[PDB]
Copies of this chain bind each other. A is one copy, B any other.
Amino acid sequence: NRPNRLIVDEAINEDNSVVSLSQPKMDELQLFRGDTVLLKGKKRREAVCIVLSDDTCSDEKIRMNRVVRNNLRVRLGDVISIQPCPDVKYGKRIHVLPIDDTVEGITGNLFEVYLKPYFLEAYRPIRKGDIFLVRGGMRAVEFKVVETDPSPYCIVAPDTVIHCEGEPIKREDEEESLNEVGYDDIGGCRKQLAQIKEMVELPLRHPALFKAIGVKPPRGILLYGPPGTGKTLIARAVANETGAFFFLINGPEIMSKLAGESESNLRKAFEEAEKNAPAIIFIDELDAIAPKREKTHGEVERRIVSQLLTLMDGLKQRAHVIVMAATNRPNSIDPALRRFGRFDREVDIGIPDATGRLEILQIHTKNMKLADDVDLEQVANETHGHVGADLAALCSEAALQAIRKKMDLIDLEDETIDAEVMNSLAVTMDDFRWALSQSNPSALRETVVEVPQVTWEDIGGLEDVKRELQELVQYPVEHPDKFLKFGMTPSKGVLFYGPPGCGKTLLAKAIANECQANFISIKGPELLTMWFGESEANVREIFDKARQAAPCVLFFDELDSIAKARGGNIGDGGGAADRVINQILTEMDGMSTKKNVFIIGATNRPDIIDPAILRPGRLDQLIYIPLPDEKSRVAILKANLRKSPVAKDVDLEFLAKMTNGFSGADLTEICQRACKLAIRESIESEIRRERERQTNPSAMEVEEDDPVPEIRRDHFEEAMRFARRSVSDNDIRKYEMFAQTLQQSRGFGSFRF
């Protein structure tokens, strides 16, 4: 219509396709009932204008029938210009092709039924997959018109010779055409995408603008995007939306085994596309595969690369040519085309944001069931780890889990498959959450494999530490607000300088279970490689994966091992490792974005720490965790008892008093030993009862006959007699000295005037 769009919400008429001719609509656009002005809808939309001017009763609003919007595969409220468009022209002999799902079951001759329904709903919709108000024949007679350029909307006239439907159009092909890939069907990084999309379109939509500029437009940019992000899918969909002489290319076809056959085929394709109309091609990282006569020794490949470069960058290459390049290697090493003029531009693609994730999720759900039981906004807010095609796969997995539950929640339902039941299945926030827990990011899916992790509730003590971890996690959710208020960035991570060997893996697992993001963990065993220089390459790969997967954590296991105290003292391997560690630290601190990371490290001792890494900035924070206290001992005992048969026979307070800060792992081991003794006693009692093999029907008054359904204080005393108390006084002194050294730098007052 105009930049002032028609508010098509509720037409004055209630037919299938009747635009309510507003006083403004019927006046500014001469939209009379006989005026069959074709509305400028979406995706080549045109029809006969059913004027529904009802300004006499109330204020006539410019509204199209909601049935028209539902039919035309559009939304109600669009702008459409009321003029006779050529998409529905005048025609003498128009081909008629009734659909197979429409021709089958129809009553009478096709011409007889059609002419009967030809006059009915003449001003119906003829847009993309538009369902005209074709009611008649006592059946779903889908008047599948050819919708040809000559008279796509057939006026009721005997002149229109109804050509026989030479083929009954199958419903599957019709659905596939309706299930097309649109430009708005992608979403995501619209800010970047439109920059190239409008650039391409305006050059064709307003070529006069390009002429007035005096500068030619690009010949097709390169999509430097993360692989498998739907980037291939997104490019294909964008090409499908564009109405141009497109001819995508693939590397497999680009690799011929004959003498120059691939290059000749590529040249022929380019020439045919140029001769056709607006050329559009798709590439798959064959330029990162281009040796540039320098990377590799494959001359035939190099020859093909050079010929392609000349074709795309040469004397009078082409007009109306769009060489769209999809960089499957995001860091496409193409020293030849990836420059000014040789490449048109470079489109950078990757993972979306939380808002973009929500948009993509909404797009996926739009073609899905009700999902009323599932809160999409909360799920998208939670789903801050996966993105793009990963998010789409997650949605598919949630649908599959809900469907598997419902089909399992029902019988096979092969006789009465209640579509109402299927719709009611929809999607559950329970099913969605179950899949999401089952789901994980694809990058981590090839990177890490988690094991069971107990919740922070199972974590005993470290209340201040738990609070700090919670604050760090919440920083991700509201850090925009904090930066807006103060303007201060958060810390990266803290070195959990815990008691020596007290077990910090427990803390790490508890954090990971309590973690709400993509928490990754380092491994001290996989630090170095025999291949020269591979260590920093592994380090670089890890850092890059972390930067890609924000928010993320880096549980630096064997922090002392990587620290190597000084670094670079003796041995060539030692020097190389020190260099790699320094490079990793510099990558960590720092010349990058540093979006969301967590430096979680536990070392043997502060002396074992890397002096440079231990320095601030390189070290964000540190947790010089001491050994367990009596209250901590009681907490650990309770946590252990959370899954055990308890008793009051042995006093937990007395146990803590006798502990004198003994190792909590020792207490857990003592509990395990007591439980094992009780279980063995129960097994022996059961064996003894079975020895008298049912001597009486009521031989066992307690059928289980649990001899130790509670904790035997005798077992506790026996475990105490064989206690460990692994707290080394020399190790105590060493950890205390390290802590005292740390605290020596500490100590400050109010410092307030």
Instruction: Name A's B-contacting residues (CB within 8 A).
Output: 1-3, 79, 176, 227-228, 232, 236, 250-252, 255-261, 263-264, 267, 284-286, 289, 296-299, 301-303, 306-307, 309-311, 313, 315-316, 328, 333, 337-341, 344-345, 348, 389, 393, 396-397, 400-401, 404, 411-412, 414-415, 442, 445-446
Residues of B with C-beta under 8 A to A400: 348
Decide if B299 touches A299 in the complex (CB within 8 Å). no
Residues of B with C-beta under 8 A to A228: 339-341
Additional A-B contact list (8), CB under 8 Å, known A176-B316, A228-B341, A255-B303: A1-B411, A252-B263, A252-B303, A257-B259, A257-B260, A257-B264, A309-B328, A338-B446
Residues of B with C-beta under 8 A to A393: 344-345
Interface centre among A79, A257, A333, A345 (most CB of B within 10 A): A257
Q: Whose C-beta in chain B lies nearest to the C-beta of A262?
A: B260
Residues of B with C-beta under 8 A to A302: 251, 289
A257 touches which of B3, B258, B298, B415 (Cβ 8 Å) = B258
Q: Whose C-beta in chain B lies nearest to the C-beta of A228?
A: B341
Q: Whose C-beta in chain B lies nearest to the C-beta of A411?
A: B1
Q: Whose C-beta in chain B lies nearest to the C-beta of A346?
A: B397
Decide if A306 touches B251 in the complex (CB within 8 Å). yes
Taking the closest CB of chain B, its distance from the CB of A345, in whole angstroms, is 6
Residues of B with C-beta under 8 A to A252: 260, 263-264, 267, 303, 306-307, 310-311
Query: 9 A-B contacts, Cβ less than 8 Å apart?
Result: A1-B415, A251-B310, A252-B307, A255-B260, A256-B260, A257-B258, A340-B442, A340-B446, A344-B393
What is the oligomeric copy number?
3
Residues of B with C-beta under 8 A to A411: 1-3
Q: Whose C-beta in chain B lies nearest to the C-beta of A347?
A: B400
Q: Whose C-beta in chain B lies nearest to the C-beta of A286?
A: B306
Main secondary structure of the interface of A (DSSP, over half): loop
Q: Whose C-beta in chain B lies nearest to the C-beta of A307?
A: B252
A345 touches which of B236, B397, B445 (Cβ 8 Å) = B397
Decide if B267 touches A310 in the complex (CB within 8 Å). no
A251 touches which of B227, B307, B313 (Cβ 8 Å) = B307
Residues of B with C-beta under 8 A to A338: 446
Residues of B with C-beta under 8 A to A389: 344
Residues of B with C-beta under 8 A to A255: 259-260, 263, 303
Residues of B with C-beta under 8 A to A232: 309, 313
Q: Whose C-beta in chain B lies nearest to the C-beta of A392?
A: B344
Taking the closest CB of chain B, its distance from the CB of A237, in whole angstroms, is 10
Residues of B with C-beta under 8 A to A396: 345
Decide if B333 touches A446 in the complex (CB within 8 Å). yes
A236 touches which of B257, B267, B298, B315 (Cβ 8 Å) = B315
Residues of B with C-beta under 8 A to A296: 297, 299
Interface centre among A298, A301, A340 (most CB of B within 10 A): A340
Residues of B with C-beta under 8 A to A299: 289, 296, 298, 301
Decide if B412 touches A1 in the complex (CB within 8 Å). yes
Residues of B with C-beta under 8 A to A227: 339
Residues of B with C-beta under 8 A to A261: 257
Residues of B with C-beta under 8 A to A2: 411, 415
Residues of B with C-beta under 8 A to A264: 252, 257
Q: In the A-B complex, list the 3 residue pairs whose CB atoms are closest, starting with the nearest.
A: A251-B306, A255-B260, A252-B307
Decide if A250 touches B340 in the complex (CB within 8 Å). no
Decide if A1 touches B303 in the complex (CB within 8 Å). no
Decide if B260 touches A401 in the complex (CB within 8 Å). no
Residues of B with C-beta under 8 A to A1: 411-412, 414-415
Taking the closest CB of chain B, its distance from the CB of A332, in whole angstroms, is 12
